[PDB]
Design a binder for this molecule. Structure first.
Ligand SMILES: COC(=O)[C@H](Cc1cccc(C(=N)N)c1)NC(=O)CNS(=O)(=O)c1ccc(C)cc1
Ligand SMILES: [Ca+2]
Length: 223
Protein backbone atom coordinates (compact mmCIF):
# COMPACT_ATOMS: atom_id res chain seq x y z
CA UNK A 1 0.00 0.00 0.00
CA UNK A 2 1.47 3.30 -1.19
CA UNK A 3 0.28 6.62 0.30
CA UNK A 4 -1.81 4.89 2.97
CA UNK A 5 -1.65 4.83 6.76
CA UNK A 6 -0.84 2.37 9.55
CA UNK A 7 -4.19 0.64 10.18
CA UNK A 8 -3.64 -0.19 13.82
CA UNK A 9 -3.30 -3.65 15.28
CA UNK A 10 -6.25 -5.90 14.53
CA UNK A 11 -8.45 -3.04 13.30
CA UNK A 12 -8.98 -5.02 10.10
CA UNK A 13 -9.69 -8.43 11.66
CA UNK A 14 -10.75 -10.20 8.42
CA UNK A 15 -7.34 -9.47 6.81
CA UNK A 16 -5.15 -12.55 6.43
CA UNK A 17 -1.53 -12.99 5.46
CA UNK A 18 -0.67 -15.93 3.17
CA UNK A 19 2.71 -17.36 4.13
CA UNK A 20 4.93 -19.89 2.30
CA UNK A 21 8.01 -19.21 4.47
CA UNK A 22 7.40 -15.48 4.03
CA UNK A 23 4.36 -13.25 3.45
CA UNK A 24 3.45 -13.37 -0.26
CA UNK A 25 -0.24 -12.33 -0.57
CA UNK A 26 -3.19 -11.16 1.47
CA UNK A 27 -6.63 -12.69 1.77
CA UNK A 28 -9.96 -12.21 3.50
CA UNK A 29 -11.52 -14.49 6.08
CA UNK A 30 -15.20 -15.10 5.03
CA UNK A 31 -16.08 -17.64 7.72
CA UNK A 32 -14.21 -19.78 10.29
CA UNK A 33 -12.99 -22.21 7.58
CA UNK A 34 -12.56 -20.21 4.39
CA UNK A 35 -10.35 -17.50 2.92
CA UNK A 36 -10.89 -15.59 -0.30
CA UNK A 37 -7.79 -14.49 -2.25
CA UNK A 38 -6.59 -13.92 -5.82
CA UNK A 39 -6.12 -16.85 -8.15
CA UNK A 40 -2.75 -15.36 -9.19
CA UNK A 41 -1.67 -15.90 -5.57
CA UNK A 42 -2.09 -19.67 -6.00
CA UNK A 43 0.82 -21.77 -4.72
CA UNK A 44 1.26 -25.04 -2.86
CA UNK A 45 2.22 -25.06 0.88
CA UNK A 46 0.12 -22.10 2.01
CA UNK A 47 -0.14 -21.35 5.69
CA UNK A 48 -2.86 -18.86 6.51
CA UNK A 49 -1.95 -16.37 9.24
CA UNK A 50 -4.87 -14.69 11.05
CA UNK A 51 -4.79 -12.04 13.83
CA UNK A 52 -1.67 -10.45 12.31
CA UNK A 53 -0.35 -6.95 12.72
CA UNK A 54 3.45 -7.12 12.69
CA UNK A 55 4.10 -10.09 10.38
CA UNK A 56 7.68 -10.49 11.74
CA UNK A 57 6.85 -10.55 15.49
CA UNK A 58 4.62 -12.86 17.49
CA UNK A 59 2.36 -10.33 19.20
CA UNK A 60 -0.12 -12.68 20.86
CA UNK A 61 -3.31 -12.68 18.76
CA UNK A 62 -2.12 -14.77 15.76
CA UNK A 63 -3.63 -17.98 14.53
CA UNK A 64 -1.56 -19.95 11.98
CA UNK A 65 -3.54 -22.64 10.18
CA UNK A 66 -2.39 -24.65 7.19
CA UNK A 67 -4.47 -24.70 3.98
CA UNK A 68 -6.07 -28.06 3.34
CA UNK A 69 -7.41 -27.26 -0.14
CA UNK A 70 -7.13 -24.42 -2.64
CA UNK A 71 -9.69 -23.81 -5.38
CA UNK A 72 -8.76 -21.44 -8.15
CA UNK A 73 -11.83 -20.20 -9.99
CA UNK A 74 -12.74 -22.63 -12.77
CA UNK A 75 -12.42 -19.93 -15.47
CA UNK A 76 -9.39 -18.10 -14.14
CA UNK A 77 -7.43 -16.76 -17.12
CA UNK A 78 -3.87 -15.84 -16.17
CA UNK A 79 -3.41 -14.18 -19.57
CA UNK A 80 -6.12 -11.57 -18.98
CA UNK A 81 -6.51 -11.88 -15.15
CA UNK A 82 -10.20 -12.48 -15.72
CA UNK A 83 -11.83 -14.28 -12.74
CA UNK A 84 -8.84 -13.56 -10.47
CA UNK A 85 -10.30 -15.30 -7.41
CA UNK A 86 -9.39 -18.35 -5.29
CA UNK A 87 -10.86 -20.09 -2.21
CA UNK A 88 -8.61 -21.56 0.46
CA UNK A 89 -10.05 -23.98 2.98
CA UNK A 90 -8.45 -24.12 6.41
CA UNK A 91 -7.25 -27.44 7.81
CA UNK A 92 -9.08 -26.57 11.05
CA UNK A 93 -11.67 -23.88 11.90
CA UNK A 94 -10.33 -20.51 13.14
CA UNK A 95 -11.39 -19.35 16.59
CA UNK A 96 -13.42 -16.23 15.85
CA UNK A 97 -12.93 -13.30 18.31
CA UNK A 98 -12.58 -9.44 18.23
CA UNK A 99 -9.22 -9.71 16.43
CA UNK A 100 -10.05 -12.56 14.06
CA UNK A 101 -13.38 -11.97 12.41
CA UNK A 102 -15.06 -12.81 9.12
CA UNK A 103 -16.18 -10.33 6.47
CA UNK A 104 -19.52 -10.84 4.69
CA UNK A 105 -20.05 -11.38 1.01
CA UNK A 106 -21.95 -8.53 -0.67
CA UNK A 107 -25.55 -8.98 -1.84
CA UNK A 108 -25.10 -6.27 -4.49
CA UNK A 109 -22.27 -4.63 -6.44
CA UNK A 110 -20.75 -1.45 -5.05
CA UNK A 111 -21.36 1.83 -6.93
CA UNK A 112 -18.94 4.34 -8.54
CA UNK A 113 -17.76 6.99 -6.04
CA UNK A 114 -18.09 4.60 -3.03
CA UNK A 115 -15.17 4.90 -0.58
CA UNK A 116 -13.66 1.53 0.20
CA UNK A 117 -11.00 0.23 2.56
CA UNK A 118 -7.97 -1.50 1.02
CA UNK A 119 -5.35 -3.16 3.17
CA UNK A 120 -2.18 -5.22 3.09
CA UNK A 121 1.51 -5.73 3.76
CA UNK A 122 2.62 -4.79 0.21
CA UNK A 123 5.31 -2.39 -1.02
CA UNK A 124 4.83 1.20 0.33
CA UNK A 125 6.85 2.97 -2.39
CA UNK A 126 5.93 3.98 -5.96
CA UNK A 127 9.63 3.98 -6.93
CA UNK A 128 11.85 1.28 -5.48
CA UNK A 129 10.70 -0.91 -2.59
CA UNK A 130 10.04 -0.87 1.13
CA UNK A 131 8.02 -3.60 2.84
CA UNK A 132 6.16 -2.79 6.07
CA UNK A 133 5.92 -5.14 9.02
CA UNK A 134 2.55 -3.73 10.17
CA UNK A 135 -0.72 -3.67 8.26
CA UNK A 136 -1.28 -0.63 6.01
CA UNK A 137 -4.65 0.84 5.03
CA UNK A 138 -5.93 3.02 2.23
CA UNK A 139 -9.31 4.66 1.64
CA UNK A 140 -10.10 4.85 -2.08
CA UNK A 141 -13.18 5.41 -4.22
CA UNK A 142 -14.40 3.02 -6.90
CA UNK A 143 -13.90 4.81 -10.26
CA UNK A 144 -16.38 4.77 -13.16
CA UNK A 145 -16.07 2.05 -15.82
CA UNK A 146 -15.46 4.73 -18.45
CA UNK A 147 -12.60 6.21 -16.41
CA UNK A 148 -11.09 2.75 -15.74
CA UNK A 149 -11.18 1.91 -19.48
CA UNK A 150 -9.06 4.93 -20.48
CA UNK A 151 -6.67 4.35 -17.55
CA UNK A 152 -5.27 1.08 -18.93
CA UNK A 153 -3.80 -0.05 -22.24
CA UNK A 154 -5.14 -3.53 -21.38
CA UNK A 155 -8.70 -4.79 -21.96
CA UNK A 156 -10.93 -4.66 -18.85
CA UNK A 157 -13.71 -7.21 -18.14
CA UNK A 158 -16.96 -6.82 -16.23
CA UNK A 159 -15.46 -9.03 -13.48
CA UNK A 160 -13.06 -6.22 -12.59
CA UNK A 161 -13.39 -2.69 -11.29
CA UNK A 162 -10.85 -0.01 -10.64
CA UNK A 163 -10.44 2.18 -7.60
CA UNK A 164 -8.00 4.74 -6.37
CA UNK A 165 -6.65 8.11 -7.49
CA UNK A 166 -5.80 9.17 -11.02
CA UNK A 167 -3.53 11.94 -9.64
CA UNK A 168 -1.10 9.32 -8.27
CA UNK A 169 0.48 8.58 -4.90
CA UNK A 170 -2.21 6.33 -3.40
CA UNK A 171 -2.67 2.69 -4.52
CA UNK A 172 -2.28 -0.99 -3.64
CA UNK A 173 1.07 -2.56 -4.67
CA UNK A 174 3.18 -5.76 -4.90
CA UNK A 175 2.39 -7.97 -1.93
CA UNK A 176 -1.12 -6.60 -1.37
CA UNK A 177 -2.55 -8.99 -4.05
CA UNK A 178 -5.32 -11.26 -2.77
CA UNK A 179 -6.24 -8.83 0.01
CA UNK A 180 -9.61 -7.11 0.70
CA UNK A 181 -11.39 -4.12 -0.74
CA UNK A 182 -14.24 -3.45 1.67
CA UNK A 183 -17.16 -1.15 0.87
CA UNK A 184 -20.47 -0.84 2.72
CA UNK A 185 -19.06 -3.20 5.32
CA UNK A 186 -18.75 -6.16 2.90
CA UNK A 187 -16.07 -7.76 0.69
CA UNK A 188 -16.49 -6.02 -2.74
CA UNK A 189 -12.99 -6.48 -4.16
CA UNK A 190 -9.80 -8.52 -4.21
CA UNK A 191 -6.48 -6.77 -4.94
CA UNK A 192 -5.82 -8.09 -8.48
CA UNK A 193 -3.54 -6.07 -10.75
CA UNK A 194 -2.07 -2.74 -11.76
CA UNK A 195 0.61 -0.98 -13.79
CA UNK A 196 3.32 -0.18 -11.27
CA UNK A 197 1.82 1.36 -8.10
CA UNK A 198 0.51 4.85 -7.40
CA UNK A 199 1.48 6.08 -10.89
CA UNK A 200 -0.44 9.02 -12.40
CA UNK A 201 -3.41 7.77 -14.44
CA UNK A 202 -2.78 4.12 -13.59
CA UNK A 203 -5.27 3.10 -10.87
CA UNK A 204 -5.49 -0.41 -9.37
CA UNK A 205 -7.83 -3.10 -10.70
CA UNK A 206 -9.75 -5.41 -8.44
CA UNK A 207 -11.76 -8.62 -8.84
CA UNK A 208 -15.47 -7.74 -8.59
CA UNK A 209 -16.50 -10.11 -5.78
CA UNK A 210 -20.26 -9.46 -6.22
CA UNK A 211 -20.10 -11.54 -9.46
CA UNK A 212 -18.71 -14.56 -7.55
CA UNK A 213 -21.08 -14.95 -4.61
CA UNK A 214 -23.02 -17.84 -6.19
CA UNK A 215 -19.82 -19.79 -6.98
CA UNK A 216 -18.37 -19.10 -3.51
CA UNK A 217 -21.55 -20.17 -1.72
CA UNK A 218 -21.91 -23.35 -3.88
CA UNK A 219 -18.26 -24.22 -3.43
CA UNK A 220 -18.16 -23.83 0.38
CA UNK A 221 -21.44 -25.83 0.55
CA UNK A 222 -19.69 -28.84 -0.90
CA UNK A 223 -16.12 -28.71 0.35
C1 LIG B 1 4.58 -6.99 -9.74
O1 LIG B 1 4.99 -5.57 -9.83
C2 LIG B 1 4.24 -4.57 -9.28
O2 LIG B 1 4.83 -3.67 -8.66
C3 LIG B 1 2.71 -4.49 -9.49
C4 LIG B 1 2.07 -5.16 -8.27
C5 LIG B 1 0.58 -4.84 -8.11
C6 LIG B 1 -0.28 -5.92 -7.93
C7 LIG B 1 -1.65 -5.69 -7.77
C8 LIG B 1 -2.13 -4.38 -7.79
C9 LIG B 1 -1.28 -3.29 -7.98
C10 LIG B 1 -1.79 -1.96 -8.01
N1 LIG B 1 -1.03 -0.95 -8.50
N2 LIG B 1 -3.02 -1.67 -7.56
C11 LIG B 1 0.09 -3.52 -8.13
N3 LIG B 1 2.32 -5.18 -10.75
C12 LIG B 1 2.63 -4.66 -11.95
O3 LIG B 1 3.19 -3.58 -12.13
C13 LIG B 1 2.25 -5.46 -13.19
N4 LIG B 1 2.15 -4.46 -14.25
S1 LIG B 1 3.21 -4.66 -15.52
O4 LIG B 1 2.94 -3.56 -16.50
O5 LIG B 1 4.57 -4.75 -15.10
C14 LIG B 1 2.74 -6.21 -16.24
C15 LIG B 1 1.66 -6.24 -17.11
C16 LIG B 1 1.25 -7.46 -17.67
C17 LIG B 1 1.93 -8.64 -17.32
C18 LIG B 1 1.49 -9.98 -17.93
C19 LIG B 1 3.01 -8.61 -16.43
C20 LIG B 1 3.41 -7.39 -15.89
CA1 LIG C 1 2.63 -11.18 14.27
Amino acid sequence: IVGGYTCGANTVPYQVSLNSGYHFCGGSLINSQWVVSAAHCYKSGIQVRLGEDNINVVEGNEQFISASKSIVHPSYNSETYNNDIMLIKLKSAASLNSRVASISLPTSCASAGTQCLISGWGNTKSSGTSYPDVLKCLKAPILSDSSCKSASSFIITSNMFCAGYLEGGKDACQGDSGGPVVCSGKLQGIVSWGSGCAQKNKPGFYTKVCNYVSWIKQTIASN
